[PDB]
C-alpha cells in the first residue's frame, strides 16, 4: 500500500482496535470510562507509540502481529501486571 507493501491490510481503525488490545492485554481495564484517567492516558499513549513503532518495523502483516504479540508477552513476562493492574 502506501507506507508498507502490506499497508492496505491495516487501516487506522484496526490499528486503534489493536492499540485497545494492547491496553486490555497489558491492563484489563475495568471500564472504558477509566481510560480518561491520566494514568490510563499514559498507557494509551504508550500503546499507540508501540503500535506505530511495530507498524514501521514490520516488513509484513504477519510480522506486525508477531512482534506485537511478542511485545505484549515480554511486557507481562517482565512486568507481570495483568491481574494486579488496578493497583
Amino acid at each position: 500500500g502506501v507506507r508498507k507493501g502490506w499497508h492496505e491490510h491495516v487501516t487506522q481503525d484496526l490499528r486503534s482496535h489493536l492499540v485497545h488490545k494492547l491496553v486490555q492485554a497489558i491492563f484489563p481495564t475495568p471500564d472504558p470510562a477509566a481510560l480518561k484517567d491520566r494514568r490510563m492516558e499514559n498507557l494509551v499513549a504508550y500503546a499507540k507509540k508501540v503500535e506505530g513503532d511495530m507498524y514501521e518495523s514490520a516488513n509484513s502483516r504477519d510480522e506486525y502481529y508477531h512482534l506485537l504479540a511478542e511485545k505484549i508477552y515480554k511486557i507481562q513476562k517482565e512486568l507481570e501486571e495483568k491481574r494486579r493492574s488496578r493497583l
Partner: peptide, 25 residues
C-alpha cells in the same frame, strides 16, 4: 502456563478475524 501463553498471544492475533467476522455493527 501454555494455555495462558497461547491466550495472551491469541488475544492480539484474533482482532482482524473478529472484526471481519463481525461484519454487522
Amino acid at each position: 502456563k501454555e494455555k495462558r501463553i497461547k491466550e495472551l498471544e491469541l488475544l492480539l492475533m484474533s482482532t482482524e478475524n473478529e472484526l471481519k467476522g463481525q461484519q454487522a455493527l
